[PDB]
Amino acid sequence: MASPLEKALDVMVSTFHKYSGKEGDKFKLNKSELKELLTRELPSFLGKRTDEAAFQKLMSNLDSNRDNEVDFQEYSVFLSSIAMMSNEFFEGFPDKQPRKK
Amino acid sequence: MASPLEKALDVMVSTFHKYSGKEGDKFKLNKSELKELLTRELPSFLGKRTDEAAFQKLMSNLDSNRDNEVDFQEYSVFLSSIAMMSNEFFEGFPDKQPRKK
């Protein structure tokens, strides 16, 4: 959250429907659209490793509905996990955590 | 995720340490800093209802460590929940979901 950046994380939700509604589902990212969205919208995250295996595993990670198309929520939860992991690993070890939660 | 917007959700993590490290913990938002961050960084979300009760409840929601200071992760998980809820309620009813997950 922030200035217009807050509303821009909301725009990241919109980023989803931008790639989703190109092919396959308009509410879910099939591997094809998932690839493009990851490569293009996560240069840092996925651009670190944009291999088919990565997309395949990532899909199975996010796509909890396991239809092999990632929904807005599964998409956002991914980004969620990103900010989380980047954070707790920013300390190197989650010390802000009760280490149980 | 997106263009620089992706890396900007990463900047939202940085948004956190901006407000956190003003007073209290540098890795956790005490009610004071939480208020300012919510009001200022979530005009849409919290600006809809920036009351002390809101902050108090929100804190207890995010602050899972329940020390009454929201950590980066609890902060991001909040934003996560935002994008999630805004999304599943964007349909009005989570139809993209297996309604069980």
From Swiss-Prot, chains A, B:
Homodimer. Interacts with PPFIBP1 in a calcium-dependent mode. Interacts with PGLYRP1; this complex acts as a chemoattractant that promotes lymphocyte movement. Interacts with MYH9; this interaction increases cell motility. Interacts with Annexin 2/ANXA2. Interacts with TP53; this interaction promotes TP53 degradation. Interacts with CCR5. Interacts with FCGR3A; this interaction inhibits PKC-dependent phosphorylation of FCGR3A. The modification N-acetylalanine is found at A2. SMART domains: EFh, S_100. Residues 12-47, 50-85 form the EF-hand domain. Ca(2+) 2 binds at D63, N65, D67, E69, E74. GO terms for cellular component: collagen-containing extracellular matrix; cytosol; extracellular exosome; extracellular region; extracellular space; nucleoplasm; nucleus; perinuclear region of cytoplasm. The modification N6-acetyllysine is found at K7, K35. Calcium-binding protein that plays a role in various cellular processes including motility, angiogenesis, cell differentiation, apoptosis, and autophagy. Increases cell motility and invasiveness by interacting with non-muscle myosin heavy chain (NMMHC) IIA/MYH9. Mechanistically, promotes filament depolymerization and increases the amount of soluble myosin-IIA, resulting in the formation of stable protrusions facilitating chemotaxis. Also modulates the pro-apoptotic function of TP53 by binding to its C-terminal transactivation domain within the nucleus and reducing its protein levels. InterPro entries: EF-hand-dom_pair, EF_Hand_1_Ca_BS, EF_hand_dom, S-100_dom, S100/CaBP7/8-like_CS, S100_Ca-bd_sub. It comes from the Eukaryota. It is found in: Secreted; Nucleus; Cytoplasm. Keywords: Acetylation, Calcium, Cytoplasm, Metal-binding, Nucleus, Repeat, Secreted. GO terms for biological process: epithelial to mesenchymal transition; positive regulation of canonical NF-kappaB signal transduction. Disulfide bonds: none annotated. This is Protein S100-A4. SUPFAM superfamilies: EF-hand. Ubiquitously expressed. GO terms for molecular function: actin binding; calcium ion binding; calcium-dependent protein binding; chemoattractant activity; identical protein binding; RAGE receptor binding; RNA binding; transition metal ion binding.
